[PDB]
Design a binder for this molecule. Sequence first.
Ligand SMILES: Cc1cc2nc3c(=O)[nH]c(=O)nc-3n(C[C@H](O)[C@H](O)[C@H](O)COP(=O)(O)OP(=O)(O)OC[C@H]3O[C@@H](n4cnc5c(N)ncnc54)[C@H](O)[C@@H]3O)c2cc1C
Ligand SMILES: Cc1cc2nc3c(=O)[nH]c(=O)nc-3n(C[C@H](O)[C@H](O)[C@H](O)COP(=O)(O)OP(=O)(O)OC[C@H]3O[C@@H](n4cnc5c(N)ncnc54)[C@H](O)[C@@H]3O)c2cc1C
Lengths: 521, 521
Amino acid sequence: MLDTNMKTQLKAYLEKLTKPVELIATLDDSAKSAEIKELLAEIAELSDKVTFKEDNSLPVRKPSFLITNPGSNQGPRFAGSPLGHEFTSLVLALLWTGGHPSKEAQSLLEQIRHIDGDFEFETYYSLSCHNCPDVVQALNLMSVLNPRIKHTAIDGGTFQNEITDRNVMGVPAVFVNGKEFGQGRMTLTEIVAKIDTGAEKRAAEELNKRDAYDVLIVGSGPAGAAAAIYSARKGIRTGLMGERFGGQILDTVDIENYISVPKTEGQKLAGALKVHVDEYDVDVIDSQSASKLIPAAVEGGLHQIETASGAVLKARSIIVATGAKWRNMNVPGEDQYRTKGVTYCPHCDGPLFKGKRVAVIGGGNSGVEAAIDLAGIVEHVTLLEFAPEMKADQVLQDKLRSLKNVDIILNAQTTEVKGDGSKVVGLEYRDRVSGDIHNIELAGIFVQIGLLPNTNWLEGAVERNRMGEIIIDAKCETNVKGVFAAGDCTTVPYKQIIIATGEGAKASLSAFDYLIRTKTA
Amino acid sequence: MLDTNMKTQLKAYLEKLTKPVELIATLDDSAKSAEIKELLAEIAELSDKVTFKEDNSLPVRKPSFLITNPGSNQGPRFAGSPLGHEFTSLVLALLWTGGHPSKEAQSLLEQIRHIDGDFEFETYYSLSCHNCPDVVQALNLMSVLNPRIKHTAIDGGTFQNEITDRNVMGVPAVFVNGKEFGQGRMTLTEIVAKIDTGAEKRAAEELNKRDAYDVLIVGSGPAGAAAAIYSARKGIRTGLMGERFGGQILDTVDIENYISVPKTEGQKLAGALKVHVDEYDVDVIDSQSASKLIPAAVEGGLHQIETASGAVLKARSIIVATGAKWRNMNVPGEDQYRTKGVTYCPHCDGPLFKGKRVAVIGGGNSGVEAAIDLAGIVEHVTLLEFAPEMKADQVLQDKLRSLKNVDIILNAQTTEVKGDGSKVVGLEYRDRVSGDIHNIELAGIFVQIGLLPNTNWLEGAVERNRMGEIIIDAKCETNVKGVFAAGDCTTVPYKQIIIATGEGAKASLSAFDYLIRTKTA
Ligand SMILES: Cc1cc2nc3c(=O)[nH]c(=O)nc-3n(C[C@H](O)[C@H](O)[C@H](O)COP(=O)(O)OP(=O)(O)OC[C@H]3O[C@@H](n4cnc5c(N)ncnc54)[C@H](O)[C@@H]3O)c2cc1C
Ligand SMILES: Cc1cc2nc3c(=O)[nH]c(=O)nc-3n(C[C@H](O)[C@H](O)[C@H](O)COP(=O)(O)OP(=O)(O)OC[C@H]3O[C@@H](n4cnc5c(N)ncnc54)[C@H](O)[C@@H]3O)c2cc1C
């Protein structure tokens, strides 16, 4: 029941068919079936691409027909008349099956193809209905895009039995796997929204779709945060990736040497840093770990960062600010009395133990210097050295032995940190030689065993010194063009917040100068 | 009228005389005069050092006598009986004249000697008076210490005429140069306090009396302030000398890139810095200028700083943080529109001119980079170069010429900054070749002519690069052992507050390590 206008329009659209289409009907002896049979034969006459076949054995509605390709069973099924306002739905279904492209967003299309489970759709419409087409067309497009999705468009006029049995009052009305799905002017996008039930392991996939950065900062402590702020103020595309925004200052309490701020808290300062970063256009990526650096193969190319999560980020320039881990005694009492007698920084907490007795753990330059420093502030210092001798420079060793409020203990290994429920009161150690245990009364324990820069993931890529520190010049340049580094992970002689932030700022401006000089050529 | 006990005590005290004393009396024929004459002859009998002379011509009180040395007229004069409670005053006056030392503080003594004007003292006492001696003795000691001070101690019992005429109701009562001076238990110190009327040019003299410092920081901007804080926390003797606490941040307003602080003011930040410095034991010296560095002649010796005011400070270690001056256009309108369109920092104020038109002054690397930077943020940039060509690197020159919102003007000299009463609206410049004047409409003027590190006063002492920047290594060490430098005055590639403060911190810890290694040996 096509008129001359419909037939001519179909001649035109079916010329855009690049693949053969087949129309497989399943029919009874009713007038409705004769109407569909006449229709399909008329559509087959308008193109040598379209073919009308019949199979009245199949267990489907009668009349109905499948729009598919030769040697296939994938495609949309019309049940009843696909004419009226559904005529464009019919035409579109032929084109799509025929290899003509969809007008939908390309991303949305791939989401249909890569879909998890089986869904059997069926929509109830009428020929008079104005809204039904968009729904039918949308679902039709899904069945064409992947065979796991099936769709059968029911004409209510033909199948009055179903719309009256299956209690639908309005059209369009959609069903899935038996269950009711929804009604009304559904878009394609919102149907794909309800159908996809996916959660985890998506973050990595979100990161590969990410565009290349002008600068990508790896690590989000004070150094990375400062670099991010200085970078985003130049208006360049700035990404700040880290494991845990805040870095080492998150697990500290009282900070009294961030210049211009007599006393703040670690958590508060980490929060302030975030606020300041968020003032500018900075793509902040949290809970991710750089696992590898792949340096660019050409000047003016892109460095790449691989994540433990499987993603790969890319950038014109990189700033490594991954900081360090400060080595622990690894003994009972240690964790419980951190910020509360157990400390890892003589520069930070030294002033707090005036008149108190303390221990330093470690007999290297760090430890021995620390003891000498503290010895001028505190009542008494005891240095515990694991080995039979201190590794520190001889000048420092001599200086420490010439102090009247200092005990050196060699072959000493800490076994326990002792407190009173809220604060340190003493220390337990083992003589490694005799095996004996001894106790020391004290208020503070300064752990100076060593620093482990978080840089082993860069082995081979950028040059490091013999301590794992990333080697840098005054401009924070590494041996790799367009890779910079800032803060504790680098060769900076001292490890502090105010120092780290300055370096972060330095590395940002050095990265920016690098970009200026590499964009034109 | 000495008894046996007085005479024997005098034999003993007059043996401590190292210089000859003379007692010159001026007498009449009264009983009082015979009493004094008998006294002086009895005192002369008790020592071959003491001599009794008489001169009744002199125009002084009668009886009275001067305690002096041969061939001199300097000394205290007693008028009437120096016996009773004034006997120790008499003895003390002889000892002092005789070369026996004072029991007074040595500093206080030199203050008497080095005193400005002429003062003629005279004290009224009685023999019964308990308090009078300390006053008399004090003033006596002054007349002995310098001849410009004169003192005459009047016995009220002998000279009833004066205490009744000159209306004194109580003793002791002191007079100066005719005028009344004061009464009661005056100390020496409080008399010297009222007598000295000195004000200016004392600060320099206060600085030489100052003890040597562990570390002396020269310059009191962000860098010096941070160094001072880090130093004073180690508990060492820390001095912070500068011309004007606050440095360059005092003459700025909005600061938005001090990390962890989204927006502060220069004056506020300078104040915060002061508060933080004052939390620790830091000798802050303001309004002074280092004019010269004299490096120590030995390892473990002392560096010295000379001031323009004439003082010399000394220290085991030095940190130079004198910053820089940012060169001006030197034109009308410039001063008036600073912080208000005229700026000297692309990193600081670049973000403020989104959508605005700006000029950069200077065609060196700083200027050209600045233009390239701003060109990405602002509507339009115009670079004015004084010379016929830009000095900048060719890569940068090419990059700037390849930008669509940029004008380069050569042979251009700024003549006027134009505003509307509160903000910049344009610029006036001269073509150096044709002499013509031209106007440019704009909102911002970024002056990038050059930096002048405040370091010329160090020529010869510490090595500088070809830009006047103090050369330093990652530890902020100069070529002179125990001299460090931090901030804009050094070779740090970038000049910013957060950068400067980090360096200040670095230099402090490097200075401290230097001290540890130089004290024992
Ligand atoms: C308990 C404690 C108290 C302290 N108190 C003070 C104090 O009072 N004053 C002071 O000045 N200093 C103090 N410090 C030192 C100060 O915290 C550090 O010097 C400073 O935080 C270093 O900044 P940073 O950004 O260079 O490194 P970090 O702070 O260590 O930050 C580096 C960040 O990068 C992340 N990261 C590491 N590896 C990767 C990777 N592969 N991929 C992605 N991200 C990664 C880390 O998880 C971390 O979040 C203290 C340190 C500790 C441990
Ligand atoms: C107008 C303006 C705005 C700025 N805005 C910003 C901003 O928003 N953000 C930012 O990060 N940076 C900004 N800066 C830069 C920043 O102020 C400097 O980088 C920083 O102040 C340098 O610190 P400094 O201690 O090393 O030097 P300075 O700040 O210059 O301090 C050095 C001090 O030493 C004194 N001194 C000099 N010679 C002697 C001597 N012979 N004896 C004794 N004392 C001496 C000086 O008078 C001064 O007080 C701005 C600069 C200017 C000029």
